[PDB]
């Protein structure tokens, strides 16, 4: 009953920070006066201990306490969420957190992991712990109507847009042949992580970043030179990921349902996700 948890850096769901000199995590409270629960998480820096906290870490602690399991947390080695790719050929393999979970390097994924058909074929997802969708981030002053803007639908190198490599958004644009023109543009430009793409929008090196709205709205509220455009063009949820033989499956899902119903998720969203408009 000691679970290897894999996660990934992705504010506001998972914050990653250096430990203190003695290798513990600095005691800290949120803006509203709540203790910040921090766990040691090892990850690439070679491999070093670090501090992780945020929406998904609070959820993990609640799960661990409710179902009575213990855990060790690590950050996915390749830094990706996970897509399936051809190897060399014949065989297909998952990368990212999906790969680690399938290979047994992790027993559970606790992260803002998008639920889709492609992944649900190989793993078991909980019922969604967060409902959200896809939207588009641009520098304030940039003008696009959204996903059907002619500068997106008929791409050139005069207007660059991208998402994160090896993520559910990559899968989304790759799976539809009518989106092949957009995909051809994006793959030329996709970023290694959400944070780098966001920075590139600020630096005017990327004109539009297509990504999770739970993340993009948080970013736009922290950084007023950034705005989202077009509301949600697609709706999707995040869920806990487990292998199909997990004995924890049912109880994780029941716990998530219970937590929506009793205001626990409301608390988390107010602590971590909610935000004052610019």
């Amino acid at each position: 009953t000691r679970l290897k948890i894999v996660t990934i850096h992705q504010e506001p769901f998972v914050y990653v920070k250096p430990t203190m000199s003695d290798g513990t995590c600095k005691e800290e409270f949120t803006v509203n006066g709540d203790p910040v629960k921090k766990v040691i998480c090892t990850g690439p820096n070679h491999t070093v201990p670090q501090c992780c906290y945020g929406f998904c870490i609070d959820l993990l602690i609640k799960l661990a306490r409710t179902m009575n399991f213990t855990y060790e947390v690590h950050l996915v080695a390749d830094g990706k969420f996970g897509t399936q790719e051809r190897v060399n050929s014949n065989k297909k393999e998952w990368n990212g957190m999906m790969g680690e979970l399938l290979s047994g390097q992790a027993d559970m994924i606790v992260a803002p992991l998008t639920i889709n058909n492609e992944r649900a074929q190989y793993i078991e997802f909980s019922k969604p712990f967060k409902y959200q969708g896809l939207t588009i981030l641009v520098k304030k002053g940039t003008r696009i109507t959204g996903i059907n803007d002619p500068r997106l639908r008929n791409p050139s190198d005069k207007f660059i847009y991208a998402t994160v490599k090896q993520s559910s958004v990559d899968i989304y644009f790759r799976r539809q042949v009518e989106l092949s023109t957009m995909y051809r543009h994006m793959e030329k430009h996709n970023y290694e992580s959400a944070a780098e793409a966001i920075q590139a929008v600020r630096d005017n090196k990327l004109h539009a970043f297509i990504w999770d709205s739970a993340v993009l709205e948080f970013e736009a509220s922290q950084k007023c030179d950034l705005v989202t455009t077009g509301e949600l063009f697609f709706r999707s949820g995040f869920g806990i990921g487990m292998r199909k033989d997990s004995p924890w499956k049912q109880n994780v899902s029941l716990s998530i349902l219970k937590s929506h119903e009793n205001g626990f998720m409301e608390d988390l969203d107010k602590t971590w996700v909610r935000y004052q408009e610019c």
């Binding site: 967060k130 989304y172 709706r235 999707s236 998720m265």
Partner: protein, 278 residues
């Protein structure tokens, strides 16, 4: 046979709409559904009557039947609605599944913890939760707004209510005891009466199921009635298909539903049946 499934549903426009049969057959976008119709109100005697069903959920059932390759005998539940536990006996659609009279239930069936203990649910195919409807201009966030939690802290104090004896009231009773007590004098006989109260200024806010409120806002004559943003929905969940616990159909149903969502077919059904002119 093994491939022919007993399936229960429940009349509830626009999700399930029931019509009389023609020509003795069901045509257009309708499918056969039968109803056990009572002889009178003081008896268990009744007669099976042939009807025709259509709607958002029926289109979903049609897609599933084609994709997952099953055939079905569809009937309308007669004892209860969606499902409540009365004297530790489940009624409604939930009851039909629990007591093995239906292999699955399709309809506007909300996923929750209590029901999940006795049936398995598919992934959500429509997002819902507890939302708030107001007349445009009125300023509130969602259920957790202090204006709801502590109405007396504001002037004038907010007038807001729900429909008694449903899941919204039940949730509020559990989560916000003073709010629940406060609302009792503003509660509404039904959704229709609530919309009038809002329009005629006798009520400032109406708190209810998100999917229902979104439907109503979409078709409000004048387009003045509006709901809070989906980011503020409380106890987010979804409508899902209920199956018997351990059912051999659940994986296939789940994958198909996620494929439908992934291919935009779900967004198409919503535009067809749920999205209004506002």
């Amino acid at each position: 046979d093994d491939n022919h499934l007993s399936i229960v549903t429940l009349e509830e426009a626009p999700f399930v709409i029931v019509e009389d049969i023609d020509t003795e057959t069901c045509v257009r976008n309708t499918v056969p559904c039968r109803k056990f119709v009572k002889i009178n109100n003081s008896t268990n005697e009744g007669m099976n009557v042939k009807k025709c069903c259509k709607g958002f959920c029926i289109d979903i059932l049609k897609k599933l039947s084609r994709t997952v390759k099953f055939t079905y005998d569809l009937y309308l539940v007669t004892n209860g609605k969606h499902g409540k536990k009365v004297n530790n006996v489940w009624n409604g659609m939930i009851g039909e599944v629990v007591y093995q009279r239906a292999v699955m239930a399709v309809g506007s069936l909300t996923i929750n913890e209590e029901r999940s203990e006795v049936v398995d649910f598919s992934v959500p195919f429509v997002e819902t939760g507890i939302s708030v409807m107001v007349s445009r201009g009125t300023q509130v966030t969602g259920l957790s707004d202090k204006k709801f939690q502590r109405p007396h802290d504001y002037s004038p104090p907010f007038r807001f209510g729900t429909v008694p004896n449903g899941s919204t009231e039940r949730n509020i009773r559990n989560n916000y005891p003073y709010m629940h007590q406060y609302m009792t004098r503003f509660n509404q006989r039904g959704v229709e009466d609530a919309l009038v109260s809002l329009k005629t200024g006798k009520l400032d806010a109406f708190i209810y199921d998100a999917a229902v409120l979104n439907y109503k806002a979409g078709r409000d004559e004048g387009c003045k009635l509006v709901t809070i943003g989906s980011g503020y929905i409380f106890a987010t969940t979804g409508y899902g298909i209920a199956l018997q616990k351990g059912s051999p159909w659940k994986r296939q149903i789940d994958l198909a539903l996620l494929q439908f969502v992934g291919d935009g077919e779900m967004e198409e059904l919503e535009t067809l049946w749920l999205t209004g002119i506002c």
